Symmetry: C4
Subunit: 385 residues, 4 copies
């Protein structure tokens, strides 16, 4: 059966920890991959964790210099949620250095980009069979969401970027039906930057929250229906979500350019005028993580919020964060439940090692009593390599 997306998003007041993966603690002795960008996607029977292996095992000589991110060895794989990425319990999905995966209620769809920086090619697979193929239209690094896409009524929607990472790029929205592209629309967004977007279906409509890697320290968004009729803007809130970001002050609808020249992959949930902002705790480095509920944070420019929940302590390393969705066909409720994941990066950029790998944690929103704590990666670096 298909996967309808006509039911609105569940209102939540807290987040309960779903899964925790101890990849780097177990990888000092066991055989686990050196992974990056570990997003989670769910199916009407189970939820899988998708990661981008670098072709090497942890605590090995082939994990040297894994700060590189575009090599002919990166592959997309998947393992059951909560389990370490290992060669003996992972499933091969595609060969890619940028990827995304979804389930339309019948079969898995995976998009994977692999090729030269000028002329990369995206290969679409439906049930493990190549169905369609895209090529770069502006001859720069072609990127995908790095997260799961949104599938509504049997059609799955993704966003791809092509162009400079510090200038004006080109943005495209795709509608995919059973692995074949049936409609693509190029966004007309001058003075905007969309990159590594997190998309969820709400009311037969798709909402994506992206990162501005050029001149924005808040987060842009785009919303479109099944005919790809889009609306663009930024999240107007004093609770900035990007990293690096300035200290909290009055935001604006336009790209706020105070400390916005890079970013980290993030997300947010729209609840009318409110937002559930998930950001780090350090305005300079990727340290800590927290959840903030701003009652009027989607259109009102002030730094006042209502609820804050602690997820990772301010002294513990953090990284990419994205959002996934559990449909009523799986949970059994009458609405769509929001969930999210966080990646805990530990390695070369900020520590004196030769590699770079990240563990993951996952939370799901509930209407019950929840507590805030710190669930970090308890690895003891450096390793023996």
């Amino acid at each position: 059966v298909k996967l309808a997306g006509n039911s609105s998003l569940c209102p939540v007041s807290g987040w309960a920890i779903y899964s925790k993966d101890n990849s780097v603690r177990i990888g000092s002795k066991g055989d686990v991959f050196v992974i990056r960008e570990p997003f989670i996607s769910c199916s009407p029977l189970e939820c899988r964790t998708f990661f981008l292996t670098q072709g090497a095992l942890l605590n090995d000589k082939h994990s040297n210099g894994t700060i590189k991110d575009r090599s002919p060895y990166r592959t997309l794989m998947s393992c059951p949620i909560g389990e370490v990425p290992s060669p003996y319990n992972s499933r091969f999905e595609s060969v890619a250095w940028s990827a995304s995966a979804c389930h339309d209620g019948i079969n898995w769809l995976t998009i994977g980009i692999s090729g030269p920086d000028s002329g990369a090619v995206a290969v679409l697979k439906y049930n493990g069979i190549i169905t369609d193929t895209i090529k770069s239209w502006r001859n720069n690094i072609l990127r995908t969401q790095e997260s799961e896409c949104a599938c509504v009524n049997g059609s799955c929607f993704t966003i791809m970027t092509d162009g400079p990472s510090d200038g004006q790029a080109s943005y495209k929205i795709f509608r995919i039906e059973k692995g074949k592209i049936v409609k693509s629309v190029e966004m007309n967004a001058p003075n905007y930057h969309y990159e590594e977007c997190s998309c969820y279906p709400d009311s037969s409509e798709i909402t994506c929250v992206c990162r501005d890697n050029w001149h924005g320290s808040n987060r842009p968004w785009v919303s479109f229906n099944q005919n790809l009729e889009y609306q663009i803007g930024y999240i107007c809130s004093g609770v900035f979500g990007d990293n690096p970001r300035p200290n909290d002050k009055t935001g604006s609808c336009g790209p706020v350019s105070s400390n916005g020249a890079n970013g980290v992959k993030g997300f947010s949930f729209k609840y009318g005028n409110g937002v559930w902002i998930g950001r780090t705790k350090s305005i300079s480095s990727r340290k800590g993580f927290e959840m903030i509920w701003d009652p009027n944070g989607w259109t009102g420019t002030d730094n006042n919020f209502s609820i804050k929940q602690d997820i990772v302590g301010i002294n513990e390393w953090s990284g990419y964060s994205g959002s996934f969705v559990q449909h009523p066909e799986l949970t059994g409720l009458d609405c769509i439940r929001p969930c999210f994941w966080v990646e805990l990066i530990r390695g070369r950029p900020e520590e004196n090692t030769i590699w770079t790998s990240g563990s993951s944690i996952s939370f799901c929103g509930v209407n019950s009593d929840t507590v805030g704590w710190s669930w970090p990666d308890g690895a003891e670096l450096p390793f023996t390599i």
Copy 2:
């Protein structure tokens, strides 16, 4: 398709060894988890072993100081019975430092407690989906059975404790239907201590034998129906149950306080006025194990018994002990078969290592010819690390 639980408990005269796990012998070279409290639960198709990993492998540098029991890295996992807990053959269940799991004949229910000591939160999962959530009441260490619960007619019953571990705590009984809490009742038991209960169904009723960690050297019990109408007391037999216990003498129906200040998790089966007491051979440390049949132990205060069976030698290390049952929907008989498991702890508290891990053995009650022997953990400590 759901478990009825309306049959009486099978009368037995002996115990036949069901499974044995050589986790620590194999973990010196292989990749196995550092586990603790490995209870067992059965389903209408198979029986699983549930353990609480610390997030590190045996013979690894991350197994240092695993005598700690409440950390953000402890997770609940499960593996098929008789198999070593390994990253490559285990299934992730929940994130918890105190957990219990059950099967109501349709789907698996797992309760998992994780959070701060003052404010811990229990997350209930039905078929891998978060369904309900509980929070601590008295803001002390919220703890659960550490063993499987009892499911009768589609409802599963558990007991949770909240308060001092050497004083008067608060005790609660829960009824769970398809992951949602339907009814909770707070026990009114002055001068009692209930902790780490082992519950089994018998004639549509639930009986739990718990651990008195405050002033009792015998074991308390509680019995309730599906409406949570409870009866409380102590197992008044001269054959004491806890590990720090006096030499055998006339017991009492109230808490006997001679050597009882820090118990160990155990069990017992009621057969009218009789009991099947499972205890350790040493009254000082967790060494040895045996099963004793007292014909009038549940109500008569004398130290005379009838049958004793040897399960672990007096010079071999022992640990936690709990009880599980096999329903007629699985065995095919007309009554509920009693079974139990023992954990064999090897590590820091009594040996000169840096870690603490435990293997397990299992026994099933039969009406045939059985022998008493010693089935210890044949590990040779210390390890390389």
Copy 3:
């Protein structure tokens, strides 16, 4: 649907290699068990290899002194045919130091003996549930076939021995229906010895060829119907079967006491008056293996034969040998196909190591063109331990 054993045994003229296990070559780096007596049993869907793990991994410090054969750590496990006995791909069956397993077309039956020498107890499991239990009746040592048993209709037939290994013991035949013993008969065989039998069904009758560890260098046999009406004797051929055997000469109908004081587990197939003898190439040590077709070997005492096939070279180590059967419900033919397995022992009793482990090979009987070769264990001893 249950297995019927009414179709006669297939006439064959050669043996084609079925599977080969490189357990010891792979176990120098990988994690494989230290196994012994690796028999094979088939099911209407697949064939499994059953072995007796000793609780330790190969190339490990717990492999010291594995020449011992009765310890509380030995367990019966199973893995798919042709695959190494690894902890990550094996299934736990029972706790035993002497075991056998069978499939009656519906579910797996496993018998496992574990306990003291004087008082060992056999635990019968049907579909993983304990169903019946036997105790030693002469209180010396309780042994089983170490191979698969014969299943006709829903009943499976095994032979158990109890008594001296160098004197006169007591012999019993069991009929098992759905895990429960329905009829047992004690053999009256003065001046005979049956220790490790290989049983196959032919025409709704069961024939077992056993080991004489007291008198004879030839092999005894027993044949019985479903009511346990047995016939006893010895294989009257000049082509002797046991490993400590004399040079070929005229055989005898009773125990030939020339070099018969020990023995090795073996087999033979009856074809009227003919036999398919599987023996070792060395009359003093367990080296080499071959299959010999004697047209009148079952009753005619002469050393002349017709066909010989080489399976292991005379300079390569060999060991236990047994026979299994592929029923028409699996192969699809109209008769029962003969098959056999060989164990290749490498370790302490003949080499300068600290351990003792064995690999396995399998052959199937065919009416096509086949070749004789040597398929030994290519391990390079000693290891690094």
Copy 4:
């Protein structure tokens, strides 16, 4: 339902990266086999990778001298596509040093040759059961395709060679129906050499492209219907196929003998008069790989082509190459899709190691936009052994 063939080969204009396993650069730490001659075969549900293990793990003392390609330890195994060949995730198929496997839409058929050089015997298995067995004729090294065969209307067709590898051999075509050899025809091809052929079905007929190991630097071919009515010849193109080959010039319809003393396993697809030649970039050693589209290459002797795609760089090691097919019963299209695989050999023959192992990559043909790149093996030799 059985595969039908019955449809023509899909016209393609490019090749999309399908799978890639990083076996050699994961086996430096993990446990992977020392494999050689991989190939991929697809079933109506999944595609498997078949390899010929040498009985030893990578980075182990038993990897010494893994260049002897005919030993009694080589076995045929299979693992899911894109996954490393490991003892814990691969299935045993047969014992062979020369093998091929196929799926007729119902069950897997595997052919495996193992035995002496003069007297090797091929064992045919259907659904894991030995069904037929065939023996050598000219008492030389009996070879099979080393690739998947072609199954049309429930019958699978293979080619075997027997005779000198530098002279005139004997070639045979087999039709196999449910594991039993139905019809065999001996090819009458004087002054031809057929070896290691790659066969695909097209319009209910079989076309095979082989290697000439005696005096040809181009590639021979053979095409036959279901009654084994064959047509023989050579690929008449100036774009030569074998690895030892001269510089491009006008080809010939016979065995062009310039540098044809040896060869490497390869393939080609016929599209009327055109060819899709897959060859290496180095005319002396096995380095690089590319696909070339010659519009009239099958019959027109000129060196002009129209399309070239880069798959491995000229400075990266390459090896065997073969072709497989995805039927409409799996993809869902209306025609047969062509795909191919490449093996990346790294080890003793060309580098200063003690072993020889190869990774693999796979491509499938599409009518979309594709890019040429280099997807080599990123191993860093020598290892620690």
